[PDB]
Amino acid sequence: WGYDLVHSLKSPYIDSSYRERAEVLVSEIKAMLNPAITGDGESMITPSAYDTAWVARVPAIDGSARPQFPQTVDWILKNQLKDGSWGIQSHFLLSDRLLATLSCVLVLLKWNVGDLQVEQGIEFIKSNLELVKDETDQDSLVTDFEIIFPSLLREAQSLRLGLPYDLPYIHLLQTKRQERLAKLSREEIYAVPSPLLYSLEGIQDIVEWERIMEVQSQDGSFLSSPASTACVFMHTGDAKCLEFLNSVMIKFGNFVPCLYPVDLLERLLIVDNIVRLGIYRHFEKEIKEALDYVYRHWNERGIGWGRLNPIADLETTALGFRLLRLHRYNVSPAIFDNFKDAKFICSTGQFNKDVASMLNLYRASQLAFPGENILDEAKSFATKYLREALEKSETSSAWNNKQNLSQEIKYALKTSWHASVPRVEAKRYCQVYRPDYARIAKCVYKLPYVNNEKFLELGKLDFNIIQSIHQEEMKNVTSWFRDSGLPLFTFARERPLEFYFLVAAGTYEPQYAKCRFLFTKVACLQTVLDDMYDTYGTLDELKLFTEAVRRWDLSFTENLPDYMKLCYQIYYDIVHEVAWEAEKEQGRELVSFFRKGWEDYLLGYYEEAEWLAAEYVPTLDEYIKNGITSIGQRILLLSGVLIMDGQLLSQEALEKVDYPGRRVLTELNSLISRLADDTKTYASSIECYMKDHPECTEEEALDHIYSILEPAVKELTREFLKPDDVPFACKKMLFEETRVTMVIFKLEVKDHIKECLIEPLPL
Ligand SMILES: [Cl-]
């Protein structure tokens, strides 16, 4: 590192024009999202050729021999792909094409039209069916393919279409249909809404249409599926079914999607992606509007992808729980009881949906507050589920490989939400986010409001702008450092950038330059004080230094060794500079408060020094007591949090996050830092406990230190997210410093500096 490999950086994105471009992107994104969150253009989703064909089957309600929705037939006739299939051209999935194409072929035949589209579709189905040698070739399956396709193929067979009904793969599908059906409770279908309502068109022989209405959605759909609803309508003539088909046609014009609406899931996927790309600070108003709406529909029974689903959806529910809690809404994890039996279920529907559900459960579980056992249990289950998912052949299908599913899953399992570097996570996500991401349900589909070029464009640009601003700040940091006198203390390693990284990688916003700078000065001072108290420097010297600390008198340093006279002078300057800035920002007297903090820190350290000089091993209690004040995280954290531009902290408000002796944010951070440090390194908490408990072994002692950490981490999360009248930026600054610390204590300190501060994203 050093002055050199820093003043050599040429921050290209520092120019005001880049930030101005970012603001145009922000404004375009707001305009793009408006219909989805405040307008009526919600649920923007691509066509389903398959569902459109089912809707096209509905005969005119006036009894004439034509479709009730002739525009759907027109759509079908006009949207066949070059290869004779129907579907999304950008993404080829066999089961999707197969299903949609046969669906379209059969409806064209019904109305005796599109004779040429029909012979091209048949050719495609027959051609592609013969490329499948075994199962490992079938690729990822759209929802309920094994059930629907054989029965569609039986329909074709009665019409005597030139399809290869005898292929082994076909027989295997019937076998798989028979095995899913065997385990189906038929009586339950009519009483309790289930996932099979999404595909009634595939089990027409089984369903008693006269009893199926008790489980119809309030909007008249069957589990939000147009195909499935169309089918029920053709058997029952039920008016609410028709109203639902009408509302979807009115909305889309001449086609239908495979799910409607998707108002809850879509809103949550937009927020999720904005948050993960690191660009959330530009969209506070939109995120609130999105989540407020989700919250309105949040209920004890969970939520589906749409607000009128008669059953909850784990994917949407787990995603909603996490985002809502993350944004300080009051949500209870008892919500996850809805997905239990007797323990959890899942692993029932189509693969990608199941994996997505467990990924979201895994992530949601990490946001646990104290005493939320159900979340510890959810984590356990999701982990096992996902570990097992990697061992499955489906995970390596051509489709999932194209999207790097296994990578995503592995990354999720090795990634702790608490032990994460926020700037680094955003940078990585900018590298994984796909503007043209395709999802799977009854057919392949996209949500353009969630996955688009603009998100990524802003994601990359905003990241680079922020980073270049930090590069300039690092120039000031290293210039200050070298004229500060601190490099003269050769018994201590120079780490100015490592400390800058610690605050900047979480508290990155441009307005908090001063907070980052002062935090960095204080951490630089501290590393020298640390090495002085525990390594360099005798007890008698330290007793003198500690006395001068009590005596805030520069003139008193005459009694100190030379190296200490200088140390005191630099220390005294830094303390009062921080204090002056804090008084400036806060409008209150704070020099007394800071002096009190520094003396507790350094008196705590002298005590540790005495213990060492005496080969004294404290009890665990007195070690903890001493260690959380002696580690000096508290005075370091105050040196940043009290100088955040525009963030006002009265004494009362400050006491809610900083109060020695209480389990508030600064105390928990101190505690977590001390103990996470001992557990990484291993005069420690381990050895203290083993003195306290002569019979206990080492691994017992360690496990006990973890038994102290895990609850502390949960308390930290609650204190952070808790609604209160403390400026959230302050609370977030304390929390993020803890998270970056937790990353540090789980040669790569430098690798993180490179990724985060040095190298830009390619544009
Ligand atoms: Cl994709």
UniProtKB/Swiss-Prot annotation:
Binding sites annotated in the UniProt record for Mg(2+) 1: D530, D534
Catalysed reaction equations from the record: (2E,6E)-farnesyl diphosphate = (E,R)-alpha-bisabolene + diphosphate
Main subcellular localisation: cytoplasm
GO biological process, one term: diterpenoid biosynthetic process
Names of the cofactor(s): Mg(2+); Mn(2+); K(+)
Induction: By wounding.
Motif DDXXD motif positions after renumbering to this chain: 530-534
Binding-site positions, Mg(2+) 3: D677, T681
Subcellular location: Cytoplasm
Pfam families: Terpene_synth, Terpene_synth_C
Chain's role: Converts farnesyl diphosphate to alpha-bisabolene. Involved in defensive oleoresin formation in conifers in response to insect attack or other injury. Involved in sesquiterpene (C15) olefins biosynthesis.
Protein name (database record): Alpha-bisabolene synthase
Taxonomic lineage from the root: Eukaryota, Viridiplantae, Streptophyta, Embryophyta, Tracheophyta
